[PDB]
A paper describes a structure:
SARS-CoV-2 Mpro is a cysteine protease that forms a dimer composed of two protomers. Each protomer comprises the chymotrypsin and 3C-like peptidase domains I and II (residues 10–99 and 100–182, respectively), with the active site consisting of a Cys145-His41 catalytic dyad located in the cleft between the two antiparallel-β-barrel domains. Mpro cleaves the polyproteins at 11 positions with a consensus cleavage sequence Leu Gln | (Ser, Ala, Gly) to release nsp’s, which are required to assemble the viral replication-transcription complex. In addition to the indispensable role in viral replication, SARS-CoV-2 Mpro also plays an essential role in escaping antiviral defense by cleaving host cell proteins.
Numbering used by the authors:
A (entry chain B), B (entry chain A): 1 to 306
């Protein structure tokens, strides 16, 4: 039992973390087969970030400029290509440690693991959620650009995130591995407003089921509410509106606990309206929304890999 | 920027995680060189846990009984030894993936990363702290015995925890890798009193420094207090008493922010007495004590390993 924020095992991804330097700006890259993926603003300086012409800037770049390091193996970069905001450096040798990998675009509210690296070296792994406004609340210093987010299923590593820049607001934005940004952000260092952020309701219910499985049960009332009536209260407190698809995916936790999804919604109504009254849930005084229904199931059943 | 609870990259440890079975009781083990470390109550049944004679039970065990699995490799167990609550198995093959590793006993208040495994396969990694009463609040289902906790410095993996059993109370207990328990616990499934738990004060100050480094500054008062006057207030709210060694190790965070440690203590005193008044710190309504000063330094400067 017990319930912690769990991150995927990071071994498969460490073997792909390289350092890429182009001039005086050095950030991380992801080395799969004979290609190294990194953010295209590696070819900018601080002063180039205001209004970069990435097409012309890349044209001034030569393969010799791209210092790619693997631990301290130096890789002869033999090509450069621009796919959206991502720079694919063709290299001499294929990475012998290449895992089975997919390139996946995720949805707001889904969670992934982030391997934080600086100068091509991994320093930490942590779980985070793609907020509904497509930002992440992250741990990225200057030089953790190119750090990737991934999920793990069976033998396959599912790459979904690459970090590019910190926003003025202190939040982070990035792309899929085809280089398309999540959200309305771009790779310039300019004023960039994120959306009004909302709370991932379906994650919150799944976290409440997790708390019932782990003993914390004080928030259970003998109420119930309609889905359409629950949303009236959801909007008011800036919660994402619950759908029937969100109810359906909560089914399995509703089965394990014998608490109908709407019953659990009725407790959340009580929670949004009355607060926590000084109590906690799994040792937290706020409602947590960084666990998917899938994550809780994998933690209350022991889902493994390999 | 941003400040998340981070775990060490788990690659070095994933490669030593095996499955160990003895009858119908199966848990995880740690394969370093030609020895596999696992908790000795693997040689027990459910009914053996009440009052086990581990010496006589092991004598009744033969190497043919110990089913060790590494991925899909079956390992010849060729010997058995009892070091305290840990059973050291000889095997045919040295682990080709053996990292640089240490066997370290840690102190209360220090933190480590745990690679959670079930049936010998790694499933998750998370950061956690050894409480002052020598328990951990962890994510351990049934079959997560033998899962280890570790720190990483430079190239070296510092093994400090093996999990053994869930207490009645819902918290977990374990040993160092020489098999001596942390805290007064034993590997019997009996009523076991935990200590009165305290909040790791020096961890809380380091997390407060982390908050100023990341912009959250509302809790800074222009007050101050003495170390002995702060400790009077520490006792009342069940905080560990701050020592001068604790002040000294906050020195570097005190330097980066220009807020004297006693000044930060005076902010925390005010925090204990009046609460948070509906505000948060790094997006949390409770005081966090699962970060050492060393952890905050490693995240506010970007310390790596490689």
């Amino acid at each position: 039992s017990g319930f912690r924020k769990m991150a995927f095992p990071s071994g498969k991804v460490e073997g792909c973390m390289v350092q890429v330097t182009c001039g005086t700006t050095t950030l991380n890259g992801l080395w799969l087969d004979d290609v190294v993926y990194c953010p295209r603003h590696v070819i900018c300086t601080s002063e180039d970030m205001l209004n970069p012409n990435y097409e012309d800037l890349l044209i001034r770049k030569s393969n010799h400029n791209f210092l790619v390091q693997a631990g301290n193996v130096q890789l002869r970069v033999i090509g450069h290509s621009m796919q959206n905001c991502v720079l694919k450096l063709k290299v001499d040798t294929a990475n012998p440690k290449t895992p089975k990998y997919k390139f996946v675009r995720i949805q707001p509210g889904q969670t992934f693991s982030v391997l934080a690296c600086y100068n091509g070296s991994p320093s930490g792994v942590y779980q985070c959620a793609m907020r509904p406004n497509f930002t992440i609340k992250g741990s990225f210093l200057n030089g953790s650009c190119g750090s990737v987010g991934f999920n793990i299923d069976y033998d396959c590593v599912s790459f979904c995130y690459m970090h590019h820049m910190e926003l003025p607001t202190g939040v982070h934005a990035g792309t899929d591995l085809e280089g398309n940004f999540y959200g309305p952000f771009v790779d310039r260092q300019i004023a960039q407003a994120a959306g009004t952020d909302t709370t991932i309701t379906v994650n919150v219910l799944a976290w409440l089921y997790a708390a019932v499985i782990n003993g914390d049960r004080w928030f259970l009332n003998r109420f119930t509410t309609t889905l359409n009536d629950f949303n009236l209260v959801a909007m008011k407190y800036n919660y994402e509106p619950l759908t029937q698809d969100h109810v359906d995916i909560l089914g399995p936790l509703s089965a394990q606990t014998g608490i109908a999804v709407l019953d659990m919604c009725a407790s959340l109504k009580e929670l949004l309206q009355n607060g926590m009254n000084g109590r906690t849930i799994l040792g937290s005084a706020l409602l947590e929304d960084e666990f998917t229904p899938f994550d809780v199931v994998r933690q209350c059943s022991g889902v493994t890999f390999q």
